[model samples]
Structure formats: C-alpha cells, structure tokens
Target: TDVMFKSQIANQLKNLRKSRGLSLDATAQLTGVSKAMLGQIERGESSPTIATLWKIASGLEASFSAFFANDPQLLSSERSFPDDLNMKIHTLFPYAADTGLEIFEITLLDHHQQMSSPHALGVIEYIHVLEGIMKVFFDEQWHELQQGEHIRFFSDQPHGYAAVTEKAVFQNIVAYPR
Candidate 1:
C-alpha cells in the first residue's frame, strides 16, 4: 500500500514532465534546479526542500500542495531525540494530509543547547508558547515569549527558533497559501 502511494507520486511527476514535453534538462533549466535533481525527484528519491518544491511547483504551474494530492493516513509515532533527550513531535491535522495547513507540537528538551537555524517556507507558521519560555528568532532580533504568548509570521525571510532559559513547549499551526 505504501509503495503504491509512493509509486503514484513518482508517476505523477513523471506524467507531469511528459505532459509538458519537458525533458529533465529543460525542466531543470526552467525551474533553476539541477537536471539530476529533477530526475531524483521524479524517482521520489530526494527529500525535496521547501525551496525546491517552490521551484518545481512554479515550473509545473501547480500549487505546492499538489504534490500531496493523495489523502494519506495520519499515523503518529513517538520518536526519541538523538541523545535520548530530544523532544517528541506530534503532527495532527488532516488525517492523511501534510499540505496547505500543518499543526505541530514542539518541545524544547530540558537544558537543550543551541537552536534550530533558519529554513525556507512551508507555510505561514504561527506558534503559541504553551509552557515555559521560548526564544523565537526572526531576522536579527530575538524575542522571549512567555507562557500563553504567541507569534505568527510568514516562513519566508530568515528565521530560527530557540528555547529560553527553561524547557519550552509550543503548539503551532502553519497555513500554506496554495
């Protein structure tokens, strides 16, 4: 069942390419992505980044959410952090959808050091610090959000996230304009 779904996605890309009479090279040139990269994406072998998806979506003249047309089953599994101290991520929204809108649970492991650096846009991210303190970074400025406080912004522009002095947990919902 899983492979069938994966195959469908691969075939979708394949058909999309063929429908436009686009060679991998030509598509790559049009999308500003590498030819080999497009081939891999067609094969479903690459974990396409948000920026890459944007490029492809634009080239294909489709919404970024189009890649997730199939309704996937929502299954949640507990995953341990790298050092056994990592926080768990629980994703719950469309039972089988990770497109357009995504809800996430983020936990800042106790005494966690460092921060999650900036990344490209997936959706418009809105986060509410539920417990403890959170240090949300946008551009060059950093804001310390206390419990019950919230922040929302476009995933575009340079941004990063960090925990405050204590362990923090946040409930977030990101809406992508398709």
Candidate 2:
C-alpha cells in the first residue's frame, strides 16, 4: 500500500505538471522545491513531506488534497508521513474547486509531531479531536485539546500537531478563500 501510494502521488504530480505544460525547472521555481527534489518525487524515489507537498499545491494553484486520487465508493485514500512521525492522513472529503473546503482524518502516534509550513493566504483550519489528547502549536504557543474539543484558526501561519497520549485521532477541515 505504501509503495502504491507513493507511485500514485508521483503520477499525479507528473500529470499535473504536464497538463500545465510546465518544465521541471519551471515547476521547481514555482514550487520553491529544488529541481532535483522534484525529479526525485516524480520518479517515486522520494515521498515528499507534507510541507513540500503544500508548497507544490500552492505553487500549482491546486488543492492540497488534489494529489490524492478519489475513490468515491470506498473513500479509502490515505497517506503516511515519510519518517518516524508515524502520522497517517486519510482524505475524508477531497477538495472540490466549487466548495473550497477539504476534510481529513489524521492519526498520530504518541510523542510524534507533525509541523506544517504556512498555507496560502486566507486559509483556515478547523480541528476536532476524536480521541485521546492532542497539542496544537500555532501563534507562538501550544494549545492542548481533549476528545470532543475543537479549535479553528487561520492556518496561513506555521502550525503543528503532536500526539500527547497513546495515540490521537482528529478531524482536520481546511477552508480556502476563493
């Protein structure tokens, strides 16, 4: 599943670039990702971190969820972070250009952290904890949230999440201004 997921992302990236008639160098310049790294990602040799993927999505003017192909009936598309974070993300509602919103279910292992680069301007994120404890970092401080707790904030600034218990599960809803 991991390998297949990686290749799926690779193919989607390549297709998006080609469909837009963008050369690798152009894409690198647009995405702030090195050309070599872009090549590695397109070749499925590297699974890009969420930060890198966000950069690509912003540069390409694509939805962050666009890289994940939709499986409507099963709705099973998911991706895992590249390293020891042991974080997993499942796309619950992929972005629709018309709606400008996307939803995801995220799980993080205890003691693991996932930090994200700032998203595009006017982006807002709503997080609702489903189980266990989570610590969200943004605005220069960490905010602890327990099960059934929720928070919403502008996500155009750096933000992060950490699992504070055995495991944490949460819903992440992102809204992008049209």
Maximum-lDDT candidate: 2
lDDT of 2 by residue, 21-138 (tens): 9999999988788999999989999878777888888778778767764434323545555543478778888887787999999988866888887787788899999999999999
Q: List candidate 2 segments past 4 Å from native.
A: 70-75, 79-85
lDDT of 1 by residue, 1-178 (tens): 3344445456666777787898998888766778998887678676554446556755665544355454333224323322234455565553224456656677777645433322234446788988888777665678788899998876554565667655888886757556
Tell me the lDDT of model 1 at 108. Answer: 70
The lDDT values for all models are 0.61, 0.83
Q: Report clashes for each candidate as comma-separated counts.
A: 1, 0
Worst 10 residues of 2 by lDDT: 69-78
For candidate 2, the per-residue lDDT at 103 reads: 90
lDDT of candidate model 2 versus the reference: 0.83
